[PDB]
Scaffold this motif. Sequence first.
Motif, mmCIF file in Angstrom:
data_model
loop_
_atom_site.group_PDB
_atom_site.id
_atom_site.type_symbol
_atom_site.label_atom_id
_atom_site.label_comp_id
_atom_site.label_asym_id
_atom_site.label_seq_id
_atom_site.Cartn_x
_atom_site.Cartn_y
_atom_site.Cartn_z
ATOM 1 N N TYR A 3 0.413 -1.542 0.192
ATOM 2 C CA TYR A 3 -0.396 -0.210 0.015
ATOM 3 C C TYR A 3 0.758 0.953 0.202
ATOM 4 C CZ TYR A 3 -3.346 3.804 1.700
ATOM 5 O OH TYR A 3 -4.682 4.198 1.654
ATOM 6 N N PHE A 4 0.348 2.294 -0.373
ATOM 7 C CA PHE A 4 1.385 3.307 -0.715
ATOM 8 C C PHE A 4 0.296 4.747 -0.992
ATOM 9 C CE2 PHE A 4 2.612 6.614 -4.316
ATOM 10 C CZ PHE A 4 3.182 7.089 -3.962
ATOM 11 N N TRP A 14 -7.767 6.778 -6.808
ATOM 12 C CA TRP A 14 -6.612 6.649 -7.490
ATOM 13 C C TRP A 14 -6.811 5.643 -8.123
ATOM 14 C CZ3 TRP A 14 -4.053 10.699 -8.701
ATOM 15 C CH2 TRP A 14 -3.764 12.029 -8.174
ATOM 16 N N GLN A 15 -7.584 4.970 -7.851
ATOM 17 C CA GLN A 15 -6.654 2.870 -8.436
ATOM 18 C C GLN A 15 -7.780 3.339 -10.162
ATOM 19 O OE1 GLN A 15 -4.105 0.946 -8.443
ATOM 20 N NE2 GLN A 15 -4.499 1.845 -5.827
ATOM 21 N N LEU A 16 -8.866 4.250 -10.142
ATOM 22 C CA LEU A 16 -9.404 4.671 -10.836
ATOM 23 C C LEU A 16 -8.438 5.228 -12.341
ATOM 24 C CD1 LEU A 16 -12.920 4.920 -10.100
ATOM 25 C CD2 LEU A 16 -11.988 3.246 -11.347
ATOM 26 N N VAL A 17 -7.720 6.369 -12.222
ATOM 27 C CA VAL A 17 -7.197 6.837 -13.037
ATOM 28 C C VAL A 17 -5.930 6.078 -13.218
ATOM 29 C CG1 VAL A 17 -5.650 8.631 -12.785
ATOM 30 C CG2 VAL A 17 -7.508 8.724 -11.348
ATOM 31 N N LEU A 18 -5.415 4.997 -11.802
ATOM 32 C CA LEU A 18 -3.824 4.256 -12.944
ATOM 33 C C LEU A 18 -4.670 3.434 -13.400
ATOM 34 C CD1 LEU A 18 -2.058 4.331 -9.776
ATOM 35 C CD2 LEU A 18 -1.814 5.866 -11.252
ATOM 36 N N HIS A 19 -5.955 2.648 -13.119
ATOM 37 C CA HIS A 19 -6.465 1.381 -14.500
ATOM 38 C C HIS A 19 -6.449 1.365 -15.538
ATOM 39 C CE1 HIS A 19 -6.267 -1.452 -11.055
ATOM 40 N NE2 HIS A 19 -6.882 -1.052 -10.300
ATOM 41 N N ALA A 81 3.877 9.687 -15.130
ATOM 42 C CA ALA A 81 5.106 9.477 -14.164
ATOM 43 C C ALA A 81 4.230 10.536 -12.849
ATOM 44 C CB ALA A 81 6.231 10.495 -14.559
ATOM 45 N N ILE A 82 3.528 12.067 -13.277
ATOM 46 C CA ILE A 82 2.858 12.346 -12.249
ATOM 47 C C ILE A 82 1.921 11.973 -11.707
ATOM 48 C CG2 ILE A 82 1.416 14.417 -11.967
ATOM 49 C CD1 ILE A 82 3.765 15.811 -13.409
ATOM 50 N N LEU A 83 1.027 11.497 -12.171
ATOM 51 C CA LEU A 83 -0.507 10.643 -11.510
ATOM 52 C C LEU A 83 0.065 9.548 -11.052
ATOM 53 C CD1 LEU A 83 -2.411 10.742 -14.820
ATOM 54 C CD2 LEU A 83 -2.882 12.191 -12.451
ATOM 55 N N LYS A 84 1.133 8.511 -11.146
ATOM 56 C CA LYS A 84 1.518 7.394 -10.294
ATOM 57 C C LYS A 84 2.304 7.535 -9.286
ATOM 58 C CE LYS A 84 2.651 5.421 -14.522
ATOM 59 N NZ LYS A 84 2.520 4.093 -15.274
ATOM 60 N N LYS A 85 2.243 9.092 -8.828
ATOM 61 C CA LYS A 85 3.214 9.826 -7.177
ATOM 62 C C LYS A 85 2.010 10.010 -6.427
ATOM 63 C CE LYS A 85 6.362 10.060 -6.695
ATOM 64 N NZ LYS A 85 7.399 11.033 -6.059
ATOM 65 N N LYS A 86 0.442 9.831 -7.076
ATOM 66 C CA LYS A 86 -1.169 9.856 -6.586
ATOM 67 C C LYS A 86 -0.440 10.628 -5.355
ATOM 68 C CE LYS A 86 -2.047 5.355 -5.090
ATOM 69 N NZ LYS A 86 -1.885 4.105 -4.021
ATOM 70 N N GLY A 87 -0.570 12.190 -6.254
ATOM 71 C CA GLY A 87 -0.711 13.699 -5.505
ATOM 72 C C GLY A 87 0.913 14.184 -5.233
ATOM 73 N N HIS A 88 1.716 13.128 -4.663
ATOM 74 C CA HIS A 88 3.765 13.470 -4.351
ATOM 75 C C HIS A 88 4.177 13.303 -5.075
ATOM 76 C CE1 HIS A 88 2.204 12.038 -0.074
ATOM 77 N NE2 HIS A 88 1.440 11.009 -0.786
#
Length: 160
Positions: A3-4, A14-19, A81-88
């Motif tokens: 988990y991150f 986030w999971q919907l964005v990443l999928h 790259a940006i989205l995979k940081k989930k806000g970070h």
Amino acid sequence: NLYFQGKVLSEGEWQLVLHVWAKVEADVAGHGQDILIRLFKSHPETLEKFDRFKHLKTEAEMKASEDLKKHGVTVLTALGAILKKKGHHEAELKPLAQSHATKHKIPIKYLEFISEAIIHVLHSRHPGNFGADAQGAMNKALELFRKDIAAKYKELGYQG
């Protein structure tokens, strides 16, 4: 697996964005082409920011431009790259804001334009993973991105 914890959006969101984004990157040149072409048709002014191919007029010309296809990959992989940081994503946005507010002068309004384009192409190509909830999530993620890069713009004195 491991988990991150992200920010602003829920883990769900986030999971919907990443999928969806995994599907985008699986054919990144093709999506980047669709998205930039849509952007240039909807809002021709944006075309001027690319010196290397502002001479393009027709869709067929756009589809054949190997420069435009390359830039489609650049923009999507940076945004992935940006989205995979989930806000970070403070460290990622620093250099991006630097080059965009200085060397390029890309106004916030234009990131909104490409946000609409992204959402339009994903909705059209991904019925399975881009239902209303995924699109609401993706809109929150892009808004987060635009708000954060605008703040970096203000730090740089760029009217934006």
